[PDB]
């Protein structure tokens, strides 16, 4: 029933930068605070206990401190593999509560995606649906506009995107866009095109149905 407020909720910093994450307890938690690192979909990893004690094996770039109800995690020199969501936790009792989390992204130089487009498989067309897939591979920053054109007509409403998490070594993203049409609609048109815009550059990959 005691709140732990993390700040910021997310941040982007460059490799070798100093990163500061804070966490304020609603009441007195004494020093009973731990810090965790969690890669997406993986179990959290203990970093710091008792506000400032490093856990076995944790690189010394991680450090924690306490001032009354205000707790700080510091990464003195951010490395690419430190991309994660970081969580504070109190355990003054046991009525444990976690902070809301701070997602840390690695800031990097711009990298243009390698763009690929995939027609639907003949196997899928037998089922009455056509999925056209556009791949944006190993790019930075994450923000990119991806548009579908069919016979040069701009599409809307019929696609969905998904994005990988940051690569732990080169800090890039990959992105898929999937266009769903009925087979009938697919067979009525020739040119399928995926257009990717970033900054001053827009790249369109296409195929002609049947070729």
């Amino acid at each position: 029933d005691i709140q732990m407020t993390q700040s910021p909720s997310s941040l982007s910093a460059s490799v070798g930068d100093r990163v500061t994450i804070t966490c304020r307890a609603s009441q007195s938690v004494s020093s009973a605070v731990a810090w965790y690192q969690q890669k997406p979909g993986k179990a959290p990893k203990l970093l710091i206990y008792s506000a400032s004690d490093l856990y076995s094996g944790v690189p010394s770039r991680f450090s924690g401190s306490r001032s009354g109800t205000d707790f700080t995690l510091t990464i003195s020199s951010l490395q690419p593999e430190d991309f994660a969501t970081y969580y504070c936790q109190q355990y003054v009792s046991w009525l444990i509560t976690f902070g809301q989390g701070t997602k840390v992204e690695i800031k990097r130089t711009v990298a243009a995606p390698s763009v690929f487009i995939f027609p639907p498989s003949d196997s899928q067309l037998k089922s009455g649906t056509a999925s056209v897939v556009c791949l944006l591979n190993n790019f930075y920053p994450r923000e990119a506009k991806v548009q579908w054109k069919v016979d040069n007509a701009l599409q809307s409403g019929n696609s969905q995107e998904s994005v990988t998490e940051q690569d732990s070594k080169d800090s890039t993203y990959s992105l898929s866009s999937t266009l769903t049409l009925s087979k009938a609609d697919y067979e009525k048109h020739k040119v399928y095109a995926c257009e990717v815009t970033q900054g001053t550059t827009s790249v369109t990959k296409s195929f002609n149905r049947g070729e």
């Binding site: 179990a43 995939f118 498989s121 994005v163």
Partner: protein
């Protein structure tokens, strides 16, 4: 080494029940609590319950009180979470963890619980068939429920360059995802590429040979 291995979990209807298990190895004493902590999709960590196995003392979060029970079989080194009267808000990855009776130093691998009335359905797997020196290929994994599917390539011998995208919920209420990999153009046709798609919730594995079109 200390290990916490979770089992149980999967799909269950609202109002239904599930029992999670957390089997412990490698402990040097029993002066440890056991915890259940859950993570709803896209959300933060939430403590659920604690037990001191040797004594039976338990502790619960308001959000699960009178609905979930934690217990322990010391003779089997196993803590349990009996989850009754489940709601959709209970859908999450459930972690078991230990801490000294310190911090939560060891955690299980997590197990997904999906509370929903929708039916299990295995995936359909279609090829993404293969400019310059690098070509991409992949497998589209379409229309399954519930999560998760895992994907590997060439039975694990191909790992670098693989991107397996997080699943997206389609408007049909089924999940979809793709897995892609980039390889040298010259390797097409001299190399065979196979995606291995595992959907344990339906006890189905699909291997798809991805050939040039």
């Amino acid at each position: 080494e200390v290990q916490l291995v979770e089992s149980g979990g999967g799909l269950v209807q609202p109002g239904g029940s599930l029992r999670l298990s957390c089997a412990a190895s490698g402990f040097d004493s029993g002066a440890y609590l056991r915890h259940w902590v859950r993570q709803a999709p896209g959300k933060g960590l939430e403590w659920v319950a604690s037990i001191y196995p040797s004594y039976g003392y338990t502790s619960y979060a308001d959000s699960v009180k009178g609905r979930f029970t934690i217990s322990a079989d010391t003779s089997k080194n196993t803590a349990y979470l009996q989850m009754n009267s489940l709601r959709a808000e209970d859908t999450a990855v459930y972690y078991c963890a230990r801490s000294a009776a310190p911090g939560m130093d060891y955690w299980g691998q997590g197990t997904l619980v999906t509370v929903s009335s929708a039916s299990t359905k295995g995936p359909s797997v279609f090829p993404l068939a293969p400019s310059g020196g690098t070509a991409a290929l992949g497998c589209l994994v379409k229309d399954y429920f519930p999560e998760p599917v895992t994907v590997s390539w060439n039975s694990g011998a191909l790992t670098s360059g693989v991107h397996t995208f997080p699943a997206v919920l389609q408007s049909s209420g089924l999940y979809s995802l793709s897995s892609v990999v980039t390889v040298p153009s010259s390797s097409l046709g001299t190399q065979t590429y196979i995606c291995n798609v595992n959907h344990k919730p339906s006890n189905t594995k699909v291997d798809k040979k991805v050939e040039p079109k």
